[PDB]
């Protein structure tokens, strides 16, 4: 639907939509920008991620409210409406995964871009896993695991332990272990090891980079406090 708008205009409008907190519009603009076929800059990758994270975040929150009501009940209305929201959520996840597969990941050669997109792929398979109950639940979980694992392997070879993308990836992979894979010990071990190696690398950072890294290390600490 965005094929007739300039790439630069789509990016500019995505930023305007963010300021207006119009995240559906933001995601549509960034989808159009991706479909121009050019690689995304660091800033542009962040716009893509912020847009869809906010859209799917609202769907996940709604799904959890409705699923809770459905459990307390078990007419068809509660199930029907939960299924409606769930289908809309799966459609957004499929759209993001389609953008990553066609063709963001295969053209991402730099560590910062490739790890970023693989983290995204793990995240949106994780969101599919949160609502999955059928014959493909195990395959969805393993698709999340595989994407996170490849991102982990690249990040440990190619980025310092304080890199914000590396840290956010480890944070989310640890949440995957705890919430999806039923592996709380793996979740705790990953979060602690990630935090400790980041701690030991903070001395190399400027004040601004130090603030970026410690912000995400605090989220790792919050989870460890919740989990232990």
């Amino acid at each position: 639907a965005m094929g007739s708008m300039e790439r630069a205009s789509l990016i500019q409008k995505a930023k305007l939509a963010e300021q207006a907190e119009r995240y559906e519009d933001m995601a549509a603009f960034m989808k159009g920008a991706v479909e121009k076929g050019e690689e995304l800059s660091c800033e542009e990758r962040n716009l893509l991620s912020v847009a869809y994270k906010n859209v799917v975040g609202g769907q996940r929150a709604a799904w959890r409210v409705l699923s809770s009501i459905e459990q307390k009940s078990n007419g068809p209305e509660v199930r029907e409406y939960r299924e409606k929201v769930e289908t809309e959520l799966q459609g957004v996840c499929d759209t993001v995964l389609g953008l990553l597969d066609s063709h963001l990941i295969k053209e991402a050669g730099d560590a910062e871009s490739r790890v970023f997109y693989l983290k995204m792929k793990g995240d949106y398979y994780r969101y599919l896993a949160e609502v999955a109950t059928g014959d493909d639940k195990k395959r969805i979980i393993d698709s999340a695991r595989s994407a996170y694992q490849e991102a982990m392997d690249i990040s440990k070879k190619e980025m310092p332990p304080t890199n914000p993308i590396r840290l956010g990836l480890a944070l989310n992979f640890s949440v995957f272990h705890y919430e999806i894979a039923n592996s709380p010990e793996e979740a705790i071990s990953l979060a602690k090891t990630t935090f400790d190696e980041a701690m030991a690398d903070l001395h190399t950072l400027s004040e601004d980079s130090y603030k970026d890294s410690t912000l995400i290390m605090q989220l790792l600490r919050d989870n460890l406090t919740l989990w232990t």
């Binding site: 944070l171 989310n172 705890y178 995400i216 989870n223």
Partner: peptide, 6 residues
Amino acid sequence: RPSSWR
């Protein structure tokens, strides 16, 4: 309940 990146 636990925090993913935000």
